[PDB]
Amino acid sequence: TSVKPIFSRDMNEAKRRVRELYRAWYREVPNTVHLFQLDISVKQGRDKVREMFKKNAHVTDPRVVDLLVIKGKMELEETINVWKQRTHVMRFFHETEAPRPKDFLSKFYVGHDP
Amino acid sequence: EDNKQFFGRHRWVIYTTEMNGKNTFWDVDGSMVPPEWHRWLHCMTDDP
Amino acid sequence: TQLITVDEKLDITTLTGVPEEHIKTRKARIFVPARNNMQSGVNNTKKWKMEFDTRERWENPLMGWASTADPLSNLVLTFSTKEDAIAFAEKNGWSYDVEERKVPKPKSKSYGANFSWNKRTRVSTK
Amino acid sequence: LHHAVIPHGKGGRSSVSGIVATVFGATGFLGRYLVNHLGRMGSQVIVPYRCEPYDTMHLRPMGDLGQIIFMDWNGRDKDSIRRAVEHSNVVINLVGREWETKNFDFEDVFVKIPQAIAQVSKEAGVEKFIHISHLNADIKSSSKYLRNKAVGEKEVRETFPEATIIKPADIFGREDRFLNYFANIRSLGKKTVKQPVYIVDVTKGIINAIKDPDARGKTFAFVGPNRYLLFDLVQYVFAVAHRPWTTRDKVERIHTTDRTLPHLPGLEDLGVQATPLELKAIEVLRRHRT
Amino acid sequence: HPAVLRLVMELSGEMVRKCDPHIGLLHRGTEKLIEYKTYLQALPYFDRLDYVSMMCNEQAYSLAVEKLLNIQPPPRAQWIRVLFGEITRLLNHIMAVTTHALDIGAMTPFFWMFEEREKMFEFYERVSGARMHAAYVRPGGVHQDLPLGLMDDIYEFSKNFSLRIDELEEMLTNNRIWRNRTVDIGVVTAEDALNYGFSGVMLRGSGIQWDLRKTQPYDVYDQVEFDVPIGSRGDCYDRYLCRVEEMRQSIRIISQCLNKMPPGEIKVDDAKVSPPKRAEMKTSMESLIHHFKLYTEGYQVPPGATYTAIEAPKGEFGVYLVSDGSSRPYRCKIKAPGFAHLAGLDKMSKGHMLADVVAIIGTQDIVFGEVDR
Amino acid sequence: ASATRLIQGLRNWASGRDLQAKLQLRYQEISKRTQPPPKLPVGPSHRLSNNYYCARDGRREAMPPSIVMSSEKKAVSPAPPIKRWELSQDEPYL
Amino acid sequence: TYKYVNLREPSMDMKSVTDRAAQTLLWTELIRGLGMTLSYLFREPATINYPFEKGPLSPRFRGEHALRRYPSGEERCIACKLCEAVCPAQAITIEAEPRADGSRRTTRYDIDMTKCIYCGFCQEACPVDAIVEGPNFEFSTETHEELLYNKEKLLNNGDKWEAEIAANIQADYLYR
Amino acid sequence: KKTTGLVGLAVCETPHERLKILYTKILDVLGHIPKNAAYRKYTEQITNEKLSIVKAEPDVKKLEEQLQGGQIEEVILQAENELSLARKMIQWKPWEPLVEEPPASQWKWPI
Amino acid sequence: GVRTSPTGEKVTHTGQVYDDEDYRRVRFVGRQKEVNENFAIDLIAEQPVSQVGSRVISCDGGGGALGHPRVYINLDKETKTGTCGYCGLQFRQQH
Amino acid sequence: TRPTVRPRNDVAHKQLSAFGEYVAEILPKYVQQVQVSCFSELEICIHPDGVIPVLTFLRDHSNAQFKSLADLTAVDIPTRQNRFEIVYNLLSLRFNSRIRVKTYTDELTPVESSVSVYKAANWYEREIWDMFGVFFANHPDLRRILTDYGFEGHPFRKDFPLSGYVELRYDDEVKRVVAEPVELAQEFRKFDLNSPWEAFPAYRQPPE
């Protein structure tokens, strides 16, 4: 099963590229929140960014992690340019609840949700 | 309907005052035409 | 050229941007569609249709339509083998159910069987 | 009950919820956020008005396809009001002009208007009617405004007693009255405590009260979660504003008296999180300079 | 500012550094929607993906389905399709001229040739009934042939329009300041014309003697007398000249098509693809069955993929069909001359200034609906 | 029309293209609407007794594409080289 | 067969070069352009006075989406759902029930005039010409509720004029 | 010849021997390639055909008639492109046998 | 021509009248529910049953090729008058 | 079949057959299928490692000029280990012929950026990356065109549904445009239309 790679040799170089990407996102926040005339503190946005990094935490193939690094690189280039607008950055946040919980009783009052 | 003008100034309508009671002396509209004259004045035919 | 490759399964739901709610919530169904029995034509076989489960469809209060908050409601995926069907259902992360194909059983008929001597098989009307 | 009144499936944007809310006023600020939260919920809203259709037009597209409906009423007659509450599940009284006019003083708006609408709403047979007022509306001196509101609250308790009397503190939002009042200046230094409370959690509590049972009859109040100094408030809005109809009734309303009441629940007792000044105040304090 | 697109131009002062079109402001989902319909249902997507050409794209899609289906259209329908194709080429070229005119200034010939275009919209209205989105071209011939009293009106328009294009060449075209506006802007190497995939009036206007009508005649164009103009230099005054001469050659083709109109037939005589006419429908049984199932299920198509391309006035309008053997298409893509012309904007705008960049975009017939697919 | 000859001469002197002849405003040159009703032909079908659809079956002639490949005057081109074009007669430049 | 352009050189004969120089330093063809624009000034304008003089149209214009009924009889509709089967925007919504008399009829017949792209396929697909594209053009409605026509809207709409639609169909039942 | 129709392509004056030495370089760079590959056979065939057309003719217009690819300098450019792929096809070994086949349930179209 | 709700509203030819626990009534407030005034069932019974003394007859419905296609209906039952599925208008034989 | 049937050029059939056999015999390293359609356009089905060599061959070599590039498309076909199809389309200026280079590809293993040999393929590659996800290594600029930048999911897959997951509206609460989950007011009534009964017996695939 000789399958071509993308960039790396195992998950270790993938961890190196994603921690470089996380460093770039971490020092890329304050210019964005200063520029876009936003509404949310710096640490809250940084916490949701690192939460997004925590979200995909069970991926083991090197090609998929490399491709997520490429996706984050594309999105970081677009945010460090002013190509995106206020709507997109607020669209990364989810403030428009929908507070729909996993409570089975609350799943029962508004239901049909297996 | 006059003929000596060009194509388009053939057929023109002049309305009345309160055909329903809306003071339509002024502020005339479309759809204030009966249907046979609506086939007439849109130059779809050659017959009054 | 005998490169890096690992031998693992695929988890493409990290790539296709789909909500995890609609990943873990719904459950696919893989089946050969049974023949619409009012017609008699078996060309509608020879496929492997993947559908999803039907979900909530209320009524539009203003007109009397059918509205739904279901984005994956009206898909169908036509496949040609059950092997790659189950492979794809594993590959794109969602859970799945597998029904099984049921063939028309071959029979033994004859006009001479319809016109026997002592046997009770007798059409009696034609 | 007839069908198509139950909730349907999920919630929001023609995901049909339960209530049918007949709302008075609603061209005003708190009413506009309440209509916006009902359009987010997706319920059917009936708003009558008396102004130009321009204002109800700019609050129109917040509603979904036909989910809100616009009709008409006058400040005198019960007839158009009863026509507005013919078929009405729930109804709310959000009315009031904060100064006297040549055709309407403080009398008979807060006096006549909740009486007439609560009368015709009791005759129509509504449930979970909610009347708003202000906090610290007492019979005592120096406030024609607040004593007329206290008369109106006694009216709401007397006729149609099965209501919900509700009162927030000085609420602030994108089109606040007092934040613009503190920006539109040029000013006196006295002692006063005051608590402001942010608007969207207040109206989420309002819609939670109107869609949940067990809350009828009880009067509710809304509490600013820090309850800090007036002078600190003016100095804070001064420093964050970065610049180092005003009648006497308005300036007395904002300077005179504010205090807490322990009789009645606040925010989290109803089941809604309260959010303080700072974040939303940094949001709304734009318009510094060029 | 109206033109609608995003353009990020990083530059050194009034000249350049790098200018990139962000397009995708208009994306609708035409390919996915055709993937969820039938052919006859999804014909108006082909009518309006380019929206100025209203019969050329119809002609392209109908030739795509005929080429996949192996059914020759009848000759009278072919001549009518040729006549409306050349009328539509005329209309698209005259729009491109007038929209570059108003985009640069030049307020009035816009209005003049729009009066001419209103006359041609009257002809489209009398023929189909639509103002602009006249579908009118089924796969397998022309639906609902033209009424009596049309060809002499076309004849009168042809004479009047030759005079009006002469008066347009009187107004502009040796006009001093418009020439001074456009001398040496938009140089195109023939290697760049090939590798950057420019097609149509760019290739007509710089170098290569390449025309689809005269290299692969997809219809009865082999019987009419005309000549495509070749461009001498990589510029847009010359490209304007070749547009105007293509208009006048289209007038010649319209005159010969009026002189060569056979009284043959309307549609194909294939009642499994084209629907029957209504009288024999309501009399016969087979005609009713074919009407009924042809409009419910649609005609089945043999499987396979095909590609075809014709002359849109922007260029090589390509439609690429993927048809599983079924009543629905499986995929379609539109090779777009507008997209191809937008691709080479760095080479067309490396050595100029931003007002001339606006002139470069204007002198190439862009719509940004066809740039979207 | 419906103008005097003075301003007409001014229009012809402003551009000499016989402005009275082709005026772009047609009066009665338009062919008359509500025409005599049409009769329409049927083409190379509807003549009976020969026309089996099995014969004229333009749909079913599509074949699956022929497949190949999973002393030589050869290395041919995909087509003959295209005949190079010609300067047209009707007033080229030059 | 081609005609390539820009084949003239600037002639070095003294006549042509002094004519181009006098053209440059005397502003000649700019005045020629002014002459052409004055030639279009003194014409007569092609402007119909719109609310009185309505523009010319065709016998085959596609407007109202009306319905029809039989001569001295009920609805021409059958509710066989062909128009919803062919409607490319899927704007047609049909729910059909028969009455107690036995003939098949409807309940609900909805046209999304928002979604309606005005092809004419529903006119050219109904087997009895029940739904017919109207002649007019005036819909022009202030509220988004009110451009969702129901069956009774279409019946009061098509019964607002018959002789118009029947005149157009009698003029146009042979080309289609 | 004199101000050809192409834009960025300016005419020369001695086309013949330039195109001759280009074709000799074609033959030599092809000469570095092994013989058993029939790619060498077909390229050597067509290039000796073309060079036998050219070396026998000092004409120009008749050279454009007899050899296709009008007018003249595009033949030079096309031979330059062929020399570029010759230089690239010393590498890449295209005459080797087949790289790994697909799983053969793939070009079966009608699915 | 019509009937009327107990609340005082125009009913339709389809029996879709309302409760007193609704809200489509409150969107009908102030704006006229434009029912079709003329119904459809009523016009049929006013028609004279066209009687032809044949056995199997044809029907077009108001002009050749302007209306429903040809339908050939039977007139062999006597107490059951044959009804066109398109026209609706009945027929009787004569003898 | 003398009227109403599109005739076909058997001359072009034989010429394209001989040319396809020529190309298949002279590049045995990557060629897997050469098929001639019944309507006579050439199709060459190609392993995804001879992308750059075969395109350098097809742009040049002077027995087949093929400068003109048409579409690059990707058609999403499941029930295959290699799903997607990168479809180059080439047109010869001197010859008037069209070849469809159908090279295959999977979800993840890339192909190799035809912009180094074909400048017109640049934005085609950017578009096919944004809409499908066929990765394009050794390419300068892979960004998003024909989507929103807040949008993702590669919506031209068959796996992505018709209506997207997001939906915009405006609200005065946060005073801006927000993106909610999809709330259709009408069903998009899907029609089962594929009748049985074998409309084409020539294309009968064999059974198991």
Ligand SMILES: NC(=O)C1=CN([C@@H]2O[C@H](COP(=O)(O)OP(=O)(O)OC[C@H]3O[C@@H](n4cnc5c(N)ncnc54)[C@H](OP(=O)(O)O)[C@@H]3O)[C@@H](O)[C@H]2O)C=CC1
């Ligand atoms: N400080 C504050 O702002 C606070 C106010 N409140 C309460 O909230 C309300 C004010 O909210 P806000 O939105 O800021 O202000 P508004 O004055 O704008 O809200 C009142 C609304 O009702 C209408 N209205 C009032 N009186 C009449 C009348 N006599 N006839 C017709 N229409 C009338 C108003 O004008 P129109 O008729 O043109 O629609 C407006 O639409 C009051 O009832 C007040 O008691 C509570 C707490 C704090």
Ligand code: SF4
């Ligand atoms: S309008 Fe015509 S096509 Fe539509 S359901 Fe009625 S009879 Fe059928």
Ligand code: SF4
């Ligand atoms: S014109 Fe087209 S979109 Fe409109 S109702 Fe008829 S078929 Fe549907």
Ligand SMILES: [Zn+2]
């Ligand atoms: Zn009948």
